[PDB]
Design a protein around this ligand. Structure first.
Ligand SMILES: CC[C@@H](C)Nc1cc(C(=O)N[C@H]2C[C@H]3CC[C@@H](C2)N3c2ccc(C(=O)C3CC3)cn2)c(C)cc1C(N)=O
Length: 209
């Protein structure tokens, strides 16, 4: 059963801004999303210093990028802490207002991650997103959205089990399909995410002839 919720007004306004801006360095979306993954992996790793059974839901700590060319979808999966349904309905934090203000004063989009709202840079290159997530002691959910208006949260009894962590599915814009290319992904990872302290896997798929 689907639950529908409205974005705060400032989030809808941020989305509309990002999805329509003409920024010439849109590749930074991948850095912002890998930084969120890294942070989520740090959080589970450090909780597990007190309580190592927290890692049992998925013993590997990794980041995994899966272009799906048939679907025009770029997936980014991590085995970090994940998000509770509460994180998914009410959000985490106000970073959103503080970043539109910042843009007003000439701030660069590349600085979105200083304000904790790096997730939304994905709308530089995508017009729809699914967030699949699984937190310890809660269920697996799909959060889904176009850019502005409503988002939905749905109990996930259909998809592959994450074990623990998060998978973003970016539905790429027709002008940004280069982020399905292996060499483009590799060089953007190496340029902006060179010092991430977790392995970054990239899946290349030979599709059936
Ligand atoms: C603890 C996780 C953190 C370290 N990393 C991540 C953070 C995020 C992230 O930003 N999600 C938030 C919460 C959810 C899911 C996407 C988006 C932003 N949503 C919402 C939800 C609600 C609202 C609202 O208007 C409120 C109703 C009024 C706005 N936005 C993500 C997506 C992943 C990771 C990660 N890879 O693990």
């Amino acid at each position: 059963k689907v639950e529908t919720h409205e974005f705060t007004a400032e989030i809808s306004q941020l989305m509309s801004l990002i999805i329509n801006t003409v920024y010439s360095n849109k590749e930074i979306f991948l850095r912002e999303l890998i930084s969120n993954a890294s942070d989520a992996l740090d959080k589970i790793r450090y909780q597990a210093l007190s309580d190592p059974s927290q890692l049992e839901s998925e013993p590997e700590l990794f980041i995994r990028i899966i272009p799906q060319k048939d679907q025009k979808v770029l997936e980014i999966r991590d085995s970090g802490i994940g998000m509770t349904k509460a994180d998914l309905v009410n959000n985490l934090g106000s970073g959103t207002k503080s970043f539109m203000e910042a843009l007003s004063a000439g701030a660069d989009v590349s600085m979105i991650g200083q304000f904790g709202v790096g997730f939304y840079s994905l709308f530089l290159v995508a017009d729809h997103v699914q967030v699949i997530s699984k937190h310890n002691d809660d269920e697996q959910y799909v959060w889904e959205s176009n850019a502005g208006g409503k988002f939905t949260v749905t109990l996930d009894e259909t998809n592959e089990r994450l074990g623990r962590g998060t998978m973003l599915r970016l539905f790429l814009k027709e002008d940004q399909l280069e982020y399905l290319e292996e060499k483009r992904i590799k060089e953007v990872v190496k340029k902006h995410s060179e010092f991430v302290a977790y392995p970054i896997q990239l899946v290349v798929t030979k599709e059936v002839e």
